[PDB]
Amino acid sequence: TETIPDVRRLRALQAEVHEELTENILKFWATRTHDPVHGGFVGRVGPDGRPHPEAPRGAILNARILWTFAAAYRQLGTPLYREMAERAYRYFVRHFVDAEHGGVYWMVAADGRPLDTRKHVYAQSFAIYALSEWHRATGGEAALALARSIYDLIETHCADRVHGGYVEACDRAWRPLEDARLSAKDAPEPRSMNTHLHVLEAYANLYRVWPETELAARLQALIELFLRAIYHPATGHLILFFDERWRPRSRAVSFGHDIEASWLLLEAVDVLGQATLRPRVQQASLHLARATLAEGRAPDGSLYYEIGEQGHLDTDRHWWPQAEALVGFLNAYQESGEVLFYEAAEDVWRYIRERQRDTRGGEWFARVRDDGAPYPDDKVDFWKGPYHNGRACLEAIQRLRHLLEHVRSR
Ligand SMILES: OC[C@H]1O[C@@H](O[C@H]2[C@H](O)[C@H](O)[C@H](O)O[C@@H]2CO)[C@H](O)[C@@H](O)[C@H]1O
């Protein structure tokens, strides 16, 4: 009673995804972004493709580069990917890691000097995520020890043990900040879904390589927090910002976050092997995916950006929600068996190929307007790394491999 696309279709999609990853995405990052002046990678690449080796460099971007090349090396084996990950790792430990107070700085100057020394949990999470993946890829003990040290600092200085979840930003010496905003766009509230999603993500990857008992409890608490406070069963959307007691302080809807969470929550529960929690997580996951299908898509199947605090639909197609929809829709199909989710995955992929990818300049456009016009945004910057689209391709390749195996051997 399985309804499954035929083998030609599954294999054709898998091949296209692999080609996009290796011949466009990773090719762009390995060739255009390495910096031989300061080492590591440039912090910015302009709309015209100009790299800027003197621009400030963000911890999140650099951790994303490390994660992506580590993950690609682990799954595909190409030696270039290990070389690129090694390059990212060396710069990261040298300059982003605070050897004195622990954790990673927010931003360094191109030459490595600390430039913004705040310790934001979002950045600490990406550090944990990337270091754990590099350990998974190479067995490096320093990388795992560092990830563990950062985990301890988050729990020590940030955990809210009265309410659940985490204070999201501290200064260099882990004294917490009033302003935990990631950027000007974010509500000036003490708790965000966004930061907590990436804590969950990091903690799941850390647990894969270091199954500590207390970590399992912390990861489970986060899953439970999502189900209780963040996911909204009446709407099928995540609430974005809260006070310390998880009282909602936002009405915005982010389709990209919804569909990303839809698969990351299940990844986390499965890493834990938490069979008791799984049915509820699966229910919320499928709902998030259906709500995204019904409300967050253009007729071409791409994802809109958000519904803002005053209700306005932002119809811009940003690069990362398309990536997350590819994974989230394939995941929804795997969980539910409902082929409408595969069709949605196929539609977003076609959009990615026909509109989101920048065939001219390489990689993917950050933003495409509702009329199809690309915006002249930076190709690489503090917030645009290779992780959403790189991961989306790697995930799709493996998920399609598993779907292909539903035709049993004889
Ligand atoms: O809110 C701060 C920034 O968010 C950026 O989007 C990120 C999103 O919040 C989410 O964490 C996802 O996982 O990653 C994306 C991309 O970095 C956004 O691009 C940036 O302009 C800021 O608004």
Ligand SMILES: [Cl-]
């Ligand atoms: Cl990214």
